[PDB]
CSV table of C-alpha atoms and ligand atoms in Angstrom, one decimal:
chain,number,residue,atom,x,y,z
A,7,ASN,CA,-8.7,-2.3,26.8
A,8,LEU,CA,-11.3,-4.0,24.6
A,9,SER,CA,-10.7,-3.6,20.9
A,10,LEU,CA,-13.4,-3.1,18.2
A,11,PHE,CA,-12.7,-6.7,17.2
A,12,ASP,CA,-13.4,-7.8,20.8
A,13,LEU,CA,-16.7,-6.0,20.9
A,14,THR,CA,-17.6,-7.6,17.5
A,15,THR,CA,-17.1,-11.0,19.0
A,16,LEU,CA,-19.4,-10.0,21.8
A,17,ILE,CA,-22.3,-8.7,19.7
A,18,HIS,CA,-21.9,-10.8,16.5
A,19,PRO,CA,-20.5,-14.2,17.5
A,20,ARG,CA,-20.8,-15.6,14.0
A,21,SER,CA,-18.3,-13.0,12.8
A,22,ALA,CA,-16.3,-14.1,15.8
A,23,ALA,CA,-16.3,-17.8,14.8
A,24,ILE,CA,-15.2,-16.9,11.3
A,25,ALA,CA,-12.2,-15.1,12.7
A,26,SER,CA,-11.2,-18.0,14.9
B,6,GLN,CA,-9.8,-16.7,1.2
B,7,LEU,CA,-12.7,-14.2,2.1
B,8,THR,CA,-16.0,-15.7,0.9
B,9,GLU,CA,-19.1,-13.8,0.0
B,10,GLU,CA,-20.8,-15.5,3.0
B,11,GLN,CA,-18.1,-14.1,5.3
B,12,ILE,CA,-18.4,-10.6,3.8
B,13,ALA,CA,-22.2,-10.8,4.4
B,14,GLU,CA,-21.7,-11.8,8.0
B,15,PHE,CA,-19.1,-8.9,8.5
B,16,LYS,CA,-21.5,-6.4,6.9
B,17,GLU,CA,-24.2,-7.5,9.3
B,18,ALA,CA,-21.9,-7.1,12.3
B,19,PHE,CA,-20.9,-3.6,10.9
B,20,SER,CA,-24.6,-2.7,10.7
B,21,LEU,CA,-25.0,-3.5,14.4
B,22,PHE,CA,-22.5,-0.8,15.3
B,23,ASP,CA,-23.6,1.7,12.5
B,24,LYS,CA,-26.8,2.5,14.4
B,25,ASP,CA,-27.9,5.3,12.0
B,26,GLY,CA,-27.0,3.4,8.9
B,27,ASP,CA,-24.9,6.3,7.4
B,28,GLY,CA,-22.0,3.9,6.6
B,29,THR,CA,-19.6,4.9,9.4
B,30,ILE,CA,-19.1,3.9,13.0
B,31,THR,CA,-18.6,6.9,15.3
B,32,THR,CA,-17.4,7.1,18.9
B,33,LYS,CA,-21.0,7.9,19.9
B,34,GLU,CA,-22.3,4.7,18.2
B,35,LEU,CA,-19.4,2.7,19.7
B,36,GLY,CA,-20.2,4.1,23.2
B,37,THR,CA,-23.9,3.2,22.8
B,38,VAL,CA,-23.0,-0.4,22.1
B,39,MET,CA,-20.5,-0.6,24.9
B,40,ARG,CA,-22.9,0.9,27.5
B,41,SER,CA,-25.6,-1.6,26.4
B,42,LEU,CA,-23.1,-4.3,27.4
B,43,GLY,CA,-22.6,-2.8,30.8
B,44,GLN,CA,-19.3,-1.1,29.9
B,45,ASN,CA,-18.4,2.5,30.8
B,46,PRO,CA,-15.8,3.8,28.3
B,47,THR,CA,-14.6,7.3,28.0
B,48,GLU,CA,-14.5,9.2,24.7
B,49,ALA,CA,-10.7,8.9,24.7
B,50,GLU,CA,-11.0,5.2,25.1
B,51,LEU,CA,-13.5,5.0,22.2
B,52,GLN,CA,-11.3,7.1,20.0
B,53,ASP,CA,-8.5,4.7,20.9
B,54,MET,CA,-10.5,1.8,19.7
B,55,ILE,CA,-11.4,3.6,16.4
B,56,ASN,CA,-7.8,4.7,15.8
B,57,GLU,CA,-6.5,1.2,15.8
B,58,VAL,CA,-8.5,0.3,12.7
B,59,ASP,CA,-9.0,3.8,11.2
B,60,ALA,CA,-6.9,3.2,8.1
B,61,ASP,CA,-7.6,6.6,6.5
B,62,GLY,CA,-7.3,8.7,9.7
B,63,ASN,CA,-10.7,10.4,9.4
B,64,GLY,CA,-11.8,9.4,12.9
B,65,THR,CA,-14.6,7.0,12.0
B,66,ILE,CA,-14.7,3.4,10.8
B,67,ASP,CA,-16.3,2.7,7.4
B,68,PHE,CA,-17.1,-0.8,6.1
B,69,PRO,CA,-13.8,-1.2,4.0
B,70,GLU,CA,-11.9,-0.5,7.2
B,71,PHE,CA,-14.0,-2.9,9.3
B,72,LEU,CA,-13.7,-5.6,6.6
B,73,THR,CA,-9.9,-5.1,6.5
B,74,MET,CA,-9.8,-5.5,10.2
B,75,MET,CA,-11.8,-8.7,10.2
B,76,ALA,CA,-9.8,-10.1,7.3
B,77,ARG,CA,-6.5,-9.5,9.2
B,78,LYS,CA,-7.8,-11.4,12.2
B,79,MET,CA,-8.6,-14.3,9.9
B,80,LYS,CA,-5.0,-14.6,8.8
C,101,LIG,CA1,-23.2,5.7,11.8
C,102,LIG,CA1,-11.8,5.9,8.6
C-alpha cells in the first residue's frame, strides 16, 4: 500500500518537504 | 518551477534506493530498503510500486522516471 513516493518521504525527508 | 537545488535533493534520494549505483532501482533494491524499515513486502507488491512510476514499462525506475514522479507530486 506504500508507494515509492511514500518510501522516499521516509528515507529522504528533505525530498519530502520539497513535495509538500 | 523545479530548481537545481531540488533536482540535487531528488538525485540524492534516488541514490539511496539505487544501492549499486547502476542508475536504476530494481525490486530487489526496493525490497532491501523496505525491509530495513521493518516492512515485509512481496515481490508482487514491489513490482506494483515500480509499475506506478515506470513510465517506459521496462520494469525498473531510472532517474528521469523518479524525477518525473517527484515533480508531479510538487504540482
Ligand atoms: Ca540499481
Ligand atoms: Ca523504467
